[PDB]
């Protein structure tokens, strides 16, 4: 099986060589595209916080959409632009089910070699451009945004490693789900909450309490109250309100 793997690995290197040659230009662009939507959200946030506070001040003293549509058109443009900076790349480099199938077959042929060499830890790095690309403009609180269950990375991996055998603490697939959710999704969720969420929307606030509990209830082993990244996520949510009062 190493001889067939050697053939496969040499084919893989050429396959990845075209990807990385392309990526030499596209890796700076990932940072640029991520900055572009965040600055656009910053433009949205700076304009809307200033104007809506004046509206809320009048409304609160009483009791004591145009920009959003314009923003959505440019947000969709950046979303499509991000998918067009990666449209000139083969489907096999971004279809997560195709990638998963290769590594599952790799483990199915070389279980000992996959577990001992921690080959599964290469998956979050290969998915690192992919997860950042898919979660780029994503914010599940908006009226036209997809839920986290409606993405390739979550659905394919939701039962990955959830085998009927007793969960060993060092089983690479059993450890894959904590690693991707805690170390990749939660920092991304922190960046999303700090730079993209608009706390004044009551509807988003209703979704916020629901969606936070949903993640905790779906992964009580990982997304628990003791988890430092979950704590960082919970702390960031409160701090975003503070900054929203400062701006």
């Amino acid at each position: 099986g190493i001889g067939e793997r050697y053939k496969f690995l040499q084919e893989m290197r050429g396959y990845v060589q075209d990807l990385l040659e392309c990526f030499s230009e596209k890796v700076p662009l990932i940072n640029e595209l991520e900055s572009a939507i965040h600055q656009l959200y910053k433009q949205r946030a700076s304009r809307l916080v200033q104007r809506r506070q004046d509206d809320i001040k009048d409304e609160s003293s009483e009791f004591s959409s145009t920009d959003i549509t314009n923003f959505n058109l440019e947000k969709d443009r950046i979303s499509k632009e991000s998918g067009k900076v990666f449209e000139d790349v083969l489907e096999s480099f971004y279809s997560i089910d195709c990638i998963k199938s290769q590594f599952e077959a790799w483990r199915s042929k070389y279980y000992t070699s996959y577990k001992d060499a921690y080959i599964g830890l290469c998956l979050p790095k290969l998915f690192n451009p992919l997860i950042r690309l898919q979660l780029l403009t994503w914010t599940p609180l908006e009226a036209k945004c997809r839920d986290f269950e409606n993405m390739l990375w979550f659905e394919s991996l939701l039962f990955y490693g959830c085998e009927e055998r007793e969960q060993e603490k060092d089983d690479v697939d059993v450890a894959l789900l904590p690693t991707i959710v805690e170390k990749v999704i939660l920092p991304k969720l922190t960046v999303i909450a700090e730079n993209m969420w608009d706390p004044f929307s009551t509807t988003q606030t209703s979704r916020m309490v629901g969606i936070t509990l949903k993640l905790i209830n779906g992964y009580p082993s990982v997304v628990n109250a003791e988890n430092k990244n979950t704590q960082v996520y919970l702390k960031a949510l409160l701090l975003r309100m503070r900054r929203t009062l400062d701006d």
């Binding site: 190493i2 690995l9 290197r13 990845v16 990807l19 990385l20 890796v27 790095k125 290969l126």
Partner: peptide, 28 residues
């Protein structure tokens, strides 16, 4: 960037490991 060195390393490791597996086969 990391994928270039890491994936190619496995190719060079497999060529070495074939000699190592043969050495381990011979020893056993």
């Amino acid at each position: 960037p990391e994928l270039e060195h890491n994936l190619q390393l496995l190719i060079d490791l497999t060529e070495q490991e074939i000699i190592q597996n043969d050495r381990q086969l011979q020893y056993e």
